[PDB]
Amino acid sequence: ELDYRILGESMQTVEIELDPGETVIAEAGAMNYMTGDIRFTARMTHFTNEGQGKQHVAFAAPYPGSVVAVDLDDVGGRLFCQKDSFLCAAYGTRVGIAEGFILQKLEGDGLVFVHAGGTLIRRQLNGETLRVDTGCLVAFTDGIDYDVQLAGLLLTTLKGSGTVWLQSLPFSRLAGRIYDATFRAREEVR
Amino acid sequence: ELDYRILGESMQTVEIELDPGETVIAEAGAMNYMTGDIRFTARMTHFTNEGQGKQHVAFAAPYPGSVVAVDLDDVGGRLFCQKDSFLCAAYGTRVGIAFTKRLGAGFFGGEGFILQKLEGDGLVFVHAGGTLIRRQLNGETLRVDTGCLVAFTDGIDYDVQLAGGLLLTTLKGSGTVWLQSLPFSRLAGRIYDATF
Amino acid sequence: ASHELDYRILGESMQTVEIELDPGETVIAEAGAMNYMTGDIRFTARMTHFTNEGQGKQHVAFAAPYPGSVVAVDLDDVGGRLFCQKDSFLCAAYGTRVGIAFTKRLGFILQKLEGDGLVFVHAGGTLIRRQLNGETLRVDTGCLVAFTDGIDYDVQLAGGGGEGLLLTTLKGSGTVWLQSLPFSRLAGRIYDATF
């Protein structure tokens, strides 16, 4: 279905090629630019080529990092992913769940696009168990038993054969640490 | 007039090499370091080499992304620049405002959306958050998420609309556009209202 | 003697250190830094110690909460001592002694790292390494990642938000590590533009 180009080295934007007829779906506010005949509509926000040219719409996440293109057919037409990490999808993708940490399921035959904050980390699992700061979980396949747990620092335990995609800098860690660091300036009142 | 080297790969800083008597202008919150005989004066801050040999001062924007040198000669002696995107310029650069406009109750409700005009015959350095997307127009229409506009040459018309909140900038006409994938306004905005 | 860690630095401009621990080896990092860990890694609180409690080579990964690169510094290459901005510190071999060299509130903490093992600092934006040979360098205070003995320093309000530029003056002989995008600049600029 969709053609695309992933621009940038460590920080990435995905330029979606939309031929006349084709739609692409994305979270509100991910879009960078539209060429000419692209038109958009709210309901998830859908971008469609309304004219007659090979056209472009670019998307990028609101924190620094890389975009991974995942052909759904390459992974049994299913991919689990953290709601923050979802960037965009070939129209006719089923979403839904599987503001606390949210895991989403995406399934279909098309292209899906996920963002990994900071470093992208890809690992193959073969019976091995991997433990993962929960926010650092980007996406994973089937064949992976996952289990979220707690200290008292929320940890996710993964086990099986299959693929996990991790990120070194989740948006939640970045935003929370930014807030923390602002303490003095905001203490200046009381 | 100015020698420089751009350091780093995806995240960048500009180290300006100053000969004796030479000057670079920058907002002073962008400076990272300066060698010994560099002096600075509030009017934009001016950094001058007050020594006898080569001196250095480096500058970086306060959000991740890359630096581009733009020779004003190469673009008619005028560039339009989002203010957050201005990094530094050679002394003699004429820096003015081409456009100021508040816009709603989000990020551009604060300071506002500000386009500067940079004119002259020297070197200008601008910064693009995330990756830089450079585009030549050739009588075409480009619609851009408003904060994503870094810089543009003459021959390009622009105006900002509230779309269907979605702030859109429509570009139409000639030359070169410089766009950024992760504008500070998007970075700061999403972070602001997420810690809320 | 500190444990002898192995490692690999993952990524290009935005990096993470994956530390490799042999049975019974330990690495020290602040809580919240770790990204993943293999099956036999265990951890306890005091800064938390991550230990290979099982068999063979095991791995824990760590990153800083802002974009930049990782620098491995072998303390032996620096006479057993590194000065380090607090936020720049990422992780260190067990046996590393962490002290406070400096604190100043001007309206900013330097730790001292000591031992014979590996330490890992983080540089926001780009790393700029510089060598001083009897010279003075003036830096934006947050841009200071680390330095060696031989270097004299102080933090002052620049003077000449609408106020508050901190300037660090460095002088002497040794290595200085600088970052182009300090967390404090990033946090402060975001705060100013939104809050």
Side-chain angles (χ1 to χ4, degrees):
Chain A
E1 208 160 325
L2 300 193
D3 299 326
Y4 71 85
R5 189 150 297 131
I6 298 166
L7 311 164
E9 42 274 346
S10 290
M11 292 169 87
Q12 291 175 333
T13 190
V14 54
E15 188 184 279
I16 295 295
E17 199 214 79
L18 291 171
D19 273 322
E22 298 167 348
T23 297
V24 61
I25 58 152
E27 38 154 63
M31 178 274 303
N32 292 131
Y33 62 81
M34 286 164 107
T35 71
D37 253 322
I38 309 280
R39 295 290 142 12
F40 70 91
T41 151
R43 190 107 253 172
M44 224 52 52
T45 305
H46 309 45
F47 296 78
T48 314
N49 188 172
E50 241 58 313
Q52 47 132 350
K54 39 283 172 180
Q55 298 299 259
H56 313 276
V57 220
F59 299 89
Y63 50 107
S66 74
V67 182
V68 203
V70 297
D71 184 353
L72 257 11
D73 95 35
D74 289 348
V75 282
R78 202 177 303 106
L79 182 90
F80 298 80
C81 93
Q82 177 216 51
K83 199 197 162 167
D84 275 338
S85 297
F86 171 98
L87 229 198
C88 67
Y91 173 54
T93 277
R94 206 194 178 182
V95 293
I97 1 96
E99 263 293 66
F101 169 82
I102 286 166
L103 188 72
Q104 291 199 140
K105 161 191 70 274
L106 318 170
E107 61 224 335
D109 56 307
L111 262 335
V112 85
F113 300 89
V114 297
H115 176 88
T119 307
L120 167 67
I121 317 156
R122 153 95 100 118
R123 271 178 149 254
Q124 307 284 265
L125 250 37
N126 295 343
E128 26 184 290
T129 287
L130 182 69
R131 314 205 157 72
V132 152
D133 177 56
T134 181
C136 291
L137 190 44
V138 170
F140 59 99
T141 63
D142 287 307
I144 286 155
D145 298 312
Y146 65 101
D147 177 44
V148 180
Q149 283 272 113
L150 184 48
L153 62 164
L154 277 147
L155 275 46
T156 305
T157 318
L158 311 170
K159 46 259 177 145
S161 275
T163 303
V164 311
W165 319 71
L166 306 172
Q167 67 192 159
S168 74
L169 184 52
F171 173 86
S172 48
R173 190 189 287 202
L174 191 260
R177 282 291 339 151
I178 295 287
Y179 189 70
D180 295 346
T182 65
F183 174 94
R184 170 183 231 141
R186 65 190 203 255
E187 135 263 85
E188 195 166 289
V189 289
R190 214 181 319 166
Chain B
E1 173 152 349
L2 290 185
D3 297 88
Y4 66 90
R5 46 184 193 123
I6 284 159
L7 308 171
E9 275 319 317
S10 329
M11 285 166 292
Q12 296 183 337
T13 168
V14 67
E15 190 202 81
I16 306 290
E17 181 169 283
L18 265 21
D19 302 320
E22 293 195 331
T23 301
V24 67
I25 68 174
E27 185 287 307
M31 98 91 50
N32 299 147
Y33 67 79
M34 52 191 171
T35 57
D37 318 332
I38 281 105
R39 297 290 157 264
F40 49 81
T41 300
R43 326 200 116 282
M44 278 288 90
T45 58
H46 288 43
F47 296 79
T48 309
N49 184 171
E50 309 262 271
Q52 332 295 151
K54 272 175 195 180
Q55 301 290 321
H56 304 265
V57 199
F59 303 102
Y63 49 95
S66 42
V67 176
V68 275
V70 176
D71 193 324
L72 260 18
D73 282 350
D74 282 320
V75 295
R78 191 153 57 221
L79 185 70
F80 295 91
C81 198
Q82 197 193 331
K83 173 188 152 307
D84 277 326
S85 271
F86 177 79
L87 184 48
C88 57
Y91 187 59
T93 305
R94 295 169 284 123
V95 173
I97 296 163
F99 189 71
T100 24
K101 224 198 195 161
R102 317 95 135 288
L103 249 35
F107 178 86
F108 288 123
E111 324 166 305
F113 181 76
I114 305 162
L115 268 183
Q116 294 182 305
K117 54 170 175 201
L118 320 171
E119 39 206 16
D121 76 324
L123 286 164
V124 125
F125 305 80
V126 297
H127 169 98
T131 17
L132 176 273
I133 332 281
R134 189 222 253 249
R135 284 183 154 250
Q136 330 291 331
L137 278 204
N138 297 309
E140 287 174 76
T141 269
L142 194 52
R143 275 164 308 147
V144 168
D145 186 27
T146 287
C148 287
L149 194 53
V150 182
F152 60 93
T153 56
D154 275 301
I156 297 297
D157 201 86
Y158 62 99
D159 77 294
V160 179
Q161 289 310 300
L162 212 217
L166 187 57
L167 282 314
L168 289 200
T169 292
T170 304
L171 294 184
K172 66 199 77 50
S174 79
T176 317
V177 189
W178 326 60
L179 302 170
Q180 70 200 124
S181 65
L182 178 60
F184 172 68
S185 46
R186 175 185 300 190
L187 207 209
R190 306 287 157 87
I191 281 164
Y192 167 71
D193 68 36
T195 60
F196 267 47
Chain C
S2 300
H3 301 189
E4 278 159 337
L5 319 166
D6 296 314
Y7 65 94
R8 55 187 189 121
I9 288 162
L10 306 165
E12 329 308 312
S13 293
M14 275 161 308
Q15 302 178 322
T16 305
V17 70
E18 186 187 68
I19 299 287
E20 178 188 280
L21 300 167
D22 290 339
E25 299 187 328
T26 294
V27 60
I28 258 81
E30 54 276 79
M34 92 80 181
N35 305 313
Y36 62 89
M37 60 193 168
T38 55
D40 286 0
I41 305 306
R42 297 293 183 276
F43 62 91
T44 64
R46 184 98 283 268
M47 187 132 58
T48 134
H49 291 22
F50 297 81
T51 297
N52 179 171
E53 284 310 352
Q55 69 210 170
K57 283 167 271 142
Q58 299 286 309
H59 314 276
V60 226
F62 301 103
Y66 50 113
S69 65
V70 176
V71 187
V73 182
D74 177 341
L75 254 30
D76 284 333
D77 294 342
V78 300
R81 183 191 291 101
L82 185 66
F83 306 82
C84 189
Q85 169 174 6
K86 188 173 173 192
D87 288 333
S88 298
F89 175 91
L90 220 204
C91 62
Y94 184 81
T96 312
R97 296 171 274 115
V98 185
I100 290 144
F102 181 89
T103 308
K104 201 178 191 170
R105 308 223 157 123
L106 280 175
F108 188 71
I109 298 189
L110 292 169
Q111 305 171 292
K112 191 165 299 206
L113 283 19
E114 292 171 322
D116 48 18
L118 278 158
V119 311
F120 302 83
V121 296
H122 166 100
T126 340
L127 197 247
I128 305 137
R129 199 192 278 203
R130 297 208 134 220
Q131 190 75 209
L132 300 203
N133 305 114
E135 53 222 16
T136 51
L137 183 62
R138 281 165 305 165
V139 320
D140 189 275
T141 294
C143 286
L144 182 61
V145 171
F147 53 97
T148 59
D149 290 315
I151 288 144
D152 295 341
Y153 63 95
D154 69 323
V155 179
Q156 288 312 330
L157 271 192
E163 50 57 70
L165 218 298
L166 288 173
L167 230 225
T168 295
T169 305
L170 297 162
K171 99 164 89 158
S173 309
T175 308
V176 308
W177 335 54
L178 302 162
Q179 65 192 325
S180 56
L181 185 45
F183 185 70
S184 71
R185 185 186 282 192
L186 209 201
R189 177 78 224 288
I190 282 176
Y191 176 81
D192 170 278
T194 63
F195 290 62

